[PDB]
Scaffold this active site. Structure first.
Site, PDB file in Angstrom:
ATOM      1  N   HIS A   8       0.919  -1.204  -0.146  1.00 16.29           N
ATOM      2  CA  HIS A   8       0.144   0.026   0.001  1.00 16.29           C
ATOM      3  C   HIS A   8       0.867   1.448  -0.165  1.00 16.29           C
ATOM      4  O   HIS A   8       0.614   2.234  -0.604  1.00 16.29           O
ATOM      5  CB  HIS A   8      -1.007   0.059   1.333  1.00 16.29           C
ATOM      6  CG  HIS A   8      -1.638   1.360   1.521  1.00 16.29           C
ATOM      7  ND1 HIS A   8      -2.873   1.432   1.321  1.00 16.29           N
ATOM      8  CD2 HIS A   8      -1.022   2.473   2.242  1.00 16.29           C
ATOM      9  CE1 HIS A   8      -3.092   2.847   1.688  1.00 16.29           C
ATOM     10  NE2 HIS A   8      -1.920   3.300   2.220  1.00 16.29           N
ATOM     11  N   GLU A   9       1.944   1.347   0.755  1.00 21.52           N
ATOM     12  CA  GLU A   9       2.873   2.371   0.912  1.00 21.52           C
ATOM     13  C   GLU A   9       3.467   2.617  -0.323  1.00 21.52           C
ATOM     14  O   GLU A   9       3.799   3.838  -0.938  1.00 21.52           O
ATOM     15  CB  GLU A   9       3.595   2.477   2.058  1.00 21.52           C
ATOM     16  CG  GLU A   9       3.061   2.120   3.404  1.00 21.52           C
ATOM     17  CD  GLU A   9       1.929   3.130   4.008  1.00 21.52           C
ATOM     18  OE1 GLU A   9       1.259   2.810   4.823  1.00 21.52           O
ATOM     19  OE2 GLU A   9       1.970   4.125   3.423  1.00 21.52           O
ATOM     20  N   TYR A  20     -11.873   2.420   3.747  1.00 20.82           N
ATOM     21  CA  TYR A  20     -10.833   3.254   3.857  1.00 20.82           C
ATOM     22  C   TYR A  20     -10.644   3.950   2.323  1.00 20.82           C
ATOM     23  O   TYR A  20     -10.194   5.119   2.583  1.00 20.82           O
ATOM     24  CB  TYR A  20      -9.647   2.665   4.623  1.00 20.82           C
ATOM     25  CG  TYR A  20      -8.479   3.744   4.818  1.00 20.82           C
ATOM     26  CD1 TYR A  20      -8.679   4.921   5.530  1.00 20.82           C
ATOM     27  CD2 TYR A  20      -7.284   3.446   4.137  1.00 20.82           C
ATOM     28  CE1 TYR A  20      -7.734   5.847   5.694  1.00 20.82           C
ATOM     29  CE2 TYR A  20      -6.363   4.494   4.295  1.00 20.82           C
ATOM     30  CZ  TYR A  20      -6.501   5.628   4.993  1.00 20.82           C
ATOM     31  OH  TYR A  20      -5.417   6.515   5.224  1.00 20.82           O
ATOM     32  N   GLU A  58      -5.410   7.870  -1.225  1.00 23.42           N
ATOM     33  CA  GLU A  58      -5.579   6.547  -0.497  1.00 23.42           C
ATOM     34  C   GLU A  58      -6.289   5.568  -1.243  1.00 23.42           C
ATOM     35  O   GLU A  58      -6.108   4.405  -1.353  1.00 23.42           O
ATOM     36  CB  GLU A  58      -6.395   6.715   0.740  1.00 23.42           C
ATOM     37  CG  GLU A  58      -5.980   7.606   1.870  1.00 23.42           C
ATOM     38  CD  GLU A  58      -4.388   7.343   2.307  1.00 23.42           C
ATOM     39  OE1 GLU A  58      -4.025   6.068   2.235  1.00 23.42           O
ATOM     40  OE2 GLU A  58      -3.725   8.268   2.711  1.00 23.42           O
ATOM     41  N   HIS A 110       1.799   4.576  -2.883  1.00 19.88           N
ATOM     42  CA  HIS A 110       1.749   5.967  -2.612  1.00 19.88           C
ATOM     43  C   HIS A 110       2.978   6.684  -3.227  1.00 19.88           C
ATOM     44  O   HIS A 110       2.863   7.554  -4.053  1.00 19.88           O
ATOM     45  CB  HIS A 110       1.750   6.355  -1.273  1.00 19.88           C
ATOM     46  CG  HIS A 110       0.446   6.200  -0.373  1.00 19.88           C
ATOM     47  ND1 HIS A 110      -0.550   6.855  -0.694  1.00 19.88           N
ATOM     48  CD2 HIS A 110       0.139   5.618   0.722  1.00 19.88           C
ATOM     49  CE1 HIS A 110      -1.656   6.668   0.104  1.00 19.88           C
ATOM     50  NE2 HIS A 110      -1.232   5.903   1.169  1.00 19.88           N
TER      51      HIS A 110
HETATM   52  C1  LIG Z   1      -5.180  -0.550   5.035  1.00 16.73           C
HETATM   53  C2  LIG Z   1      -4.013   0.126   5.556  1.00 16.73           C
HETATM   54  C3  LIG Z   1      -4.042   0.859   6.498  1.00 16.73           C
HETATM   55  C4  LIG Z   1      -2.819   1.421   6.958  1.00 16.73           C
HETATM   56  S1  LIG Z   1      -2.549   2.479   8.071  1.00 16.73           S
HETATM   57  O1  LIG Z   1      -1.393   2.494   8.630  1.00 16.73           O
HETATM   58  O2  LIG Z   1      -3.387   1.951   9.431  1.00 16.73           O
HETATM   59  N1  LIG Z   1      -3.221   3.653   7.546  1.00 16.73           N
HETATM   60  C5  LIG Z   1      -4.614   3.815   7.376  1.00 16.73           C
HETATM   61  C6  LIG Z   1      -5.722   3.864   8.326  1.00 16.73           C
HETATM   62  C7  LIG Z   1      -6.846   3.173   8.060  1.00 16.73           C
HETATM   63  C8  LIG Z   1      -8.157   3.040   8.833  1.00 16.73           C
HETATM   64  C9  LIG Z   1      -7.683   3.448  10.103  1.00 16.73           C
HETATM   65  N2  LIG Z   1      -9.013   3.428  10.830  1.00 16.73           N
HETATM   66  O3  LIG Z   1      -8.773   3.772  12.430  1.00 16.73           O
HETATM   67  O4  LIG Z   1     -10.132   2.930  10.584  1.00 16.73           O
HETATM   68  C10 LIG Z   1      -6.518   4.052  10.462  1.00 16.73           C
HETATM   69  C11 LIG Z   1      -5.560   4.170   9.807  1.00 16.73           C
HETATM   70  C12 LIG Z   1      -2.260   4.977   7.320  1.00 16.73           C
HETATM   71  C13 LIG Z   1      -2.906   6.290   7.926  1.00 16.73           C
HETATM   72  C14 LIG Z   1      -2.109   4.897   5.925  1.00 16.73           C
HETATM   73  O5  LIG Z   1      -2.732   5.114   4.963  1.00 16.73           O
HETATM   74  N3  LIG Z   1      -0.739   5.330   5.645  1.00 16.73           N
HETATM   75  O6  LIG Z   1      -0.245   5.427   4.326  1.00 16.73           O
HETATM   76  C15 LIG Z   1      -1.840   1.356   6.256  1.00 16.73           C
HETATM   77  C16 LIG Z   1      -1.629   0.754   4.879  1.00 16.73           C
HETATM   78  C17 LIG Z   1      -2.864   0.266   4.511  1.00 16.73           C
HETATM   79  F1  LIG Z   1      -2.942  -0.794   3.464  1.00 16.73           F
HETATM   80 ZN   LIG Z   2      -1.942   5.562   2.879  1.00 16.91          ZN
END
Ligand SMILES: Cc1cc(S(=O)(=O)N(Cc2ccc([N+](=O)[O-])cc2)[C@H](C)C(=O)NO)ccc1F
Ligand SMILES: [Zn+2]
Length: 499
Positions: A407-408, A449, A456, A411
């Protein structure tokens, strides 16, 4: 031995030390054991009524920058205002909450040490409070001057009960057998143990002289042998506080039974911290040499950082190898090389860490406002072209850390695509008008999300498109076909760029 004799023998070894404490040194040791919580009273009195009203109505769980403990304190706040499905948060809700975040933290010295890995000058809290922590920490170090010594060290064990989730929230969720809670899932246990060889305590371990029966969620029972020069202090009711910055070698990890429930015995020996930092640094060199080759980078390139300081240290190290291997297996070789070369061009890093992300320089040097700093499972910071991955925590609706990395990296792909599109006006490809329109249409068709915003949405689509599960790769093609095509287009576009 005798439990009670052992106790009196250690108490006497420290008796002069105890009698010598000032009322100030004494108050400090109690402040360390019992953090000073925020008074929910004062909090609500400082709000304007429009904020009292606004706070009551916010879906607190739909915040992506608040931890569980934080989310829970705010619901307990929400309700006391009131005693007198998952829609993305609004702009003015998020700004409000980001600032409120700074006013609800406990003053917790051991937590400050753990979150920073001992790098307490990290500008992740207000400068006045940052100096307070530092004053207290320096004072406590000076109190802890008497070593356990050459007589007692090999004649005693000390004990610590721990919650599994304090080391690894991802494995902790499924370490207790689901059909029977008195049992340890043997498979998970083998994985937790396979790469647990050393451990660092960056804060002050508070340990029991005699083993204490487990309370709620304490399935880890540490048995620790100190070294003769380990410094410590006696605390009332049979405890020792140990100096900060020590290293532990994991000698043995076993499943054991106590009162008809299963527990994990962790046997450990205190060693010099510097010995463990040497292992970490060596593994950092090793993994960079392996991956500089595979990626066709100069051999001295610094791409992968282990920023590692806490009790699950060695797993954070081994875990990075796996994460990068899954990354290699599920993403085209040429996409990987092109994007990574872009990040190296901007002095970027893959940071694998067990300290909280606001205390990572690749985040904080570009984010001056603490209300803008984020802690989470993972992050991409375009200003420093770095991917940050936090080991200990568990991502919301994320299977594992490998998926989080992808996922990162998504980005990062967004970043580089938009750069290639206009190298003089470097922007994100998801800021382009074509993608914005795609997002207003298909934006709700993938993960919950994914609805947050264009960036995102892209990163989730990217991640889903490269899942090992074929069903998931297909749900994107079917349910978000313009996004699917848009991304494969960005991918071709990147792979065909020059050298
Ligand atoms: C699914 C997912 C999550 C994350 S994460 O670390 O939890 N996350 C997203 C996230 C999603 C949902 C909640 N929430 O409180 O519902 C909290 C945080 C961070 C902010 C992100 O997008 N960084 O690029 C990271 C990657 C990923 F693929
Ligand atoms: Zn992200």
């Amino acid at each position: 031995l005798s439990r009670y004799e052992k106790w009196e023998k250690i108490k006497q070894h420290y008796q002069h030390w105890s009698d010598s404490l000032s009322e100030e040194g004494r108050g400090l040791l109690k402040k360390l054991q019992i953090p000073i919580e925020p008074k929910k009273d004062d909090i609500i009195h400082s709000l304007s009524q429009e904020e009292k009203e606004l706070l009551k109505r916010i879906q607190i769980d739909s915040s992506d920058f608040l931890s569980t403990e934080e989310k829970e304190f705010l619901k307990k706040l929400q309700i006391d205002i009131r005693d007198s499905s998952s829609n993305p948060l609004s702009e003015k809700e998020k700004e409000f909450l980001k600032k409120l975040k700074l006013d609800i933290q406990p003053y917790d010295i051991n937590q400050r040490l753990q979150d920073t890995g001992g790098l307490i000058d990290s500008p992740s809290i207000n400068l006045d409070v940052r100096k307070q922590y530092k004053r207290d920490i320096q004072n406590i170090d000076a109190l802890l001057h008497q070593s356990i010594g050459s007589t007692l060290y090999n004649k005693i064990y000390l004990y610590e009960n721990m919650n599994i989730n304090n080391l690894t929230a991802t494995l902790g969720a499924d370490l207790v057998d689901s059909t029977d809670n008195t049992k340890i899932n043997r498979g998970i246990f083998n994985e937790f143990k396979k790469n647990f060889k050393y451990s660092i305590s960056s804060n002050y371990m508070i340990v029991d002289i005699n083993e204490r029966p487990a309370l709620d969620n304490e399935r880890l029972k540490w048995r620790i042998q100190l070294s003769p020069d380990t410094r410590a202090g006696y605390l009332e009711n049979g405890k020792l506080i140990l100096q900060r910055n020590i290293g532990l070698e994991i000698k043995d990890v076993q499943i054991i039974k106590q009162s008809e429930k299963e527990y994990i015995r962790i046997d450990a020996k205190v060693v010099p911290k510097s010995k463990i930092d040497t292992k970490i640094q060596e593994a950092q060199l090793n993994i960079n040499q392996e991956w500089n080759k595979a990626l066709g980078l100069p051999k001295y390139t610094k791409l992968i950082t282990f920023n590692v300081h806490n009790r699950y240290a060695s797993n954070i190290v081994e875990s990075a190898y796996l994460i990068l291997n899954e990354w290699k297996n599920n993403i085209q070789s040429d996409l990987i090389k092109k994007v990574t070369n872009y990040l190296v061009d901007g002095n970027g890093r893959f940071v694998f860490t067990d300290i909280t992300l606001p205390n990572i320089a690749e985040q904080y040097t570009h984010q001056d406002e603490i209300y803008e700093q984020v802690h989470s499972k993972g992050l991409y910071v375009p200003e420093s072209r770095s991917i940050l991955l936090h080991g200990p925590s568990k991502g919301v609706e994320l299977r594992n850390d490998s998926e989080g990395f992808i996922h990162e990296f998504g980005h990062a792909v967004d970043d580089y695509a938009g750069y290639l599109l206009d190298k003089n006006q470097s922007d994100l490809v998801t800021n382009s008008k074509k993608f914005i329109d795609i997002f207003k249409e298909e934006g709700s068709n993938l993960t919950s999300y994914g609805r947050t915003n264009e960036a995102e949405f892209f990163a989730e689509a990217f991640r889903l498109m490269h899942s090992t599960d074929h069903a998931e790769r297909l749900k994107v093609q079917k349910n978000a076909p313009k996004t699917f095509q848009f991304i494969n287009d960005q991918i071709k576009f990147i792979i065909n760029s020059l050298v």
